Amino acid sequence: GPKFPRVKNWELGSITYDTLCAQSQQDGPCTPRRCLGSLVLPRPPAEQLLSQARDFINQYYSSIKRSGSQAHEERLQEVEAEVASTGTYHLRESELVFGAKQAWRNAPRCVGRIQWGKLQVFDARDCSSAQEMFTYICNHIKYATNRGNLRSAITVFPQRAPGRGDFRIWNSQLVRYAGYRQQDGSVRGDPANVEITELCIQHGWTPGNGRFDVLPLLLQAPDEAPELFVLPPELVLEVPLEHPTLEWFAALGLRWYALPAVSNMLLEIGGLEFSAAPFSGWYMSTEIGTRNLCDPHRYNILEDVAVCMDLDTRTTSSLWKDKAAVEINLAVLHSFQLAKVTIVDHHAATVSFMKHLDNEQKARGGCPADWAWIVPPISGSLTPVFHQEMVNYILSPAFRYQPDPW
Amino acid sequence: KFPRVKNWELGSITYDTLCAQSQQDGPCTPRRCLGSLVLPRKPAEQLLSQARDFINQYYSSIKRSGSQAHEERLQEVEAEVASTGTYHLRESELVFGAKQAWRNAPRCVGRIQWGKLQVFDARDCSSAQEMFTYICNHIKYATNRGNLRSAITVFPQRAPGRGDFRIWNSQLVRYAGYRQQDGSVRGDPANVEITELCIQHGWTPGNGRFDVLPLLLQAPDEAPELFVLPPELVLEVPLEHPTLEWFAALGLRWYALPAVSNMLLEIGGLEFSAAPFSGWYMSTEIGTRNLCDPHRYNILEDVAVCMDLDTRTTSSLWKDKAAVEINLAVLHSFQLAKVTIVDHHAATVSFMKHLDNEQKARGGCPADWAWIVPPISGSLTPVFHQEMVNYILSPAFRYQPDPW
């Protein structure tokens, strides 16, 4: 009936319509001729800045129920004046907080959005050096880790400025394991991290040689070479992996870090671009257990675990990969619980997401979601989100990919 | 322009140029992607263009493009359409058309097999009784005592101002779903509606969990007729587990032949409303979807209790552990019964080889990532890490409304 996408849940038979998608002011990669929804990474003039700024200020005043008021029209005139004399403008602190949270809420690929209202926003817009960035980051890590009782947080560094260089954190995460290319062609540690490891070495880092060496931070303040900073070990909480019934699993010496803190994304609010704005939550167990440890192009431990479980690895039909993978995931969950470090399994996460979808249906008339990323990498059809159709679209404020600084 | 397509495990890049041959719209627009939706929301010059395109594909396929036979066949089609508003395919064109529709099916992980398809021409069918004979022969051929062979039977095309030939069942073999008035369903909940239609058309119902349904067959503008399949034609595999001796005690079983019968086959603008086709099962369809889906037989909790797993909490991954044992039971049992089946690992591996064949052959291959990636162990298969482009090519299989 209504002129909006109809959206079905096939488990429950329930129907909704997404009206929120009509607020998208930015095109995705799909056309009526072909769907490109499965691609990971598909491919200012003051007039364009102003329309984005106005849109965000409207968003802000709506959220505090003062839409159309005197303070709304004054903030609008102030932003236009600011832009008129300087080419850019600045956010009030409470505007920054609302934007950072709206950006997380708007992120289609995040299954953890039930939590979006509980985000601690650290304003670091006064930072003027790389040393100072290191201080802010350390504080963030400390606050976010909270000795294993993890708290969502984001630290926002100064925005892109006309005729000045960007604040950048070169590492893709605040905590990452080194990946050392060996003379045979293979990689010790995390192959995902080969490039960043070699950049750290060029910049003067004395390299380790373990499978789990924590990388130093490479931090770049405006118009300056990046500087190297070693994280003090006591700040970086790690969890050794053991299995509840398989006693040998502990002998593998596997481990992972507690804090998933992404640091290379661009946070865009009202046309303003924050090139350095690391944020962190807590892991879903399949991220560590299935992706980081079992991806063929990552740690690739599946065959090793399977051999220890004495499975038949000469034939697909023994389901040795599925069997090993479940035990690895169980080890991740059990170890994190034993260490009292916050973690969530893929069943509890997806159930909480279904609740999130129901909330946003009422609050906003929809919720942008990327099915391929929301559905977990193991046990897909055993979670409720698998049977839930989703509509994917770009809303702003937004977290965005950005080119590597080198 | 043309999509850049990357495999994230191997770092290799292709470009899809096949998609430029798509002439029919999908559901997506640049404002929003609707790729996860299961079903679509909803003259003579048009028929002539689709007809001309298909004939061109056919003569190109046999390397005789431009031949005298080619030019004449285009005039034949043009003469039939100008005179009658429609036209008919020759058997060879139909055989080609059916294979191309399979080859073009973006949701099918089994397309490495696309050239090996037996095509039965049932276009000289005039009654429901005749459709039944054709269907029984199809099942007999396809089943082949456990050595499954892909096949399709094609019934008369749709015609203006006449009802359609239809098989009302979604698959030729399906288990009944009886709704007990205390809410629950005995049997397959996916089939409650078809089960009820059968009963009021005069079927005496059973009361088991695996009662094979009769077929409702409809000749144009006639009420459908009921036909019970000869029990010897329906091959079933009882499920047991290689190590859990209690598993056989569950009484689980499934049929060998996945034979879809409600899709529409479109070739060169002609529409075949009844064109059932079958191949063989991939184990996850039975183990994960049919037996473990919450809105199907939903046996996860039962198997979990038998394995003495901690059902109290999600963090024990009881669901994942039971699911794996069920899929293992399916593989073991089909293999023990000498019935064709492929596991999701072998299947996705063969699909990758297919993407590669098709890249060289046609410059791309339409694929629906959400459907190609198996319902358990997604990222442990190569297809997970492969980007895919989805679009509609003709000839094609399409959904069509339920005839009731």
Ligand code: HEM
């Ligand atoms: C609090 C617990 C959280 C959980 C369990 C969670 C879970 C996830 C997961 C599993 C993914 C998929 C990423 C992958 O597979 O590599 C993801 C993506 C994402 N998350 Fe969340 N998240 C959480 C908190 C946050 C926070 C605090 C933010 C930002 C303020 C955030 C923003 C994002 C963004 C932008 C993506 C997409 C990244 C990309 O496109 O590459 N998440 N999240």
Ligand code: HEM
């Ligand atoms: C020979 C072995 C075959 C295998 C292993 C196979 C595998 C599969 C699987 C796993 C699906 C997903 C279906 C679901 O989840 O319900 C599928 C879908 C599909 N298959 Fe195949 N298939 C085979 C043969 C065939 C043949 C012979 C045809 C037609 C000539 C065909 C046409 C299709 C079509 C049109 C779909 C999409 C159905 C829909 O959208 O509902 N397949 N296939």
Ligand SMILES: CNCc1cccc(OCc2ccc3ccc(N)nc3c2)c1
């Ligand atoms: C390989 N895909 C791109 C890529 C590269 C590096 C990290 C990353 O992770 C995304 C991401 C972002 C935020 C997250 C928040 C919480 C969490 N558990 N995982 C999260 C994962 C994604």
Ligand SMILES: CNCc1cccc(OCc2ccc3ccc(N)nc3c2)c1
């Ligand atoms: C969109 N409705 C989903 C739906 C409803 C009814 C049957 C069905 O089966 C799809 C299907 C089609 C062809 C197949 C060929 C081989 C095979 N193993 N499974 C196959 C599965 C799928």
Ligand SMILES: C[C@H](O)[C@H](O)[C@H]1CNc2nc(N)[nH]c(=O)c2N1
């Ligand atoms: C090709 C495909 O898009 C790619 O492998 C995606 C699929 N789904 C994903 N889902 C999550 N959560 N994270 C990922 O990196 C990916 N990768």
Ligand SMILES: C[C@H](O)[C@H](O)[C@H]1CNc2nc(N)[nH]c(=O)c2N1
């Ligand atoms: C909502 C979602 O698109 C829907 O559940 C799809 C997902 N992928 C699937 N994949 C296959 N093979 N079969 C299916 O029925 C589905 N269902």
Ligand SMILES: [Zn+2]
């Ligand atoms: Zn799309």
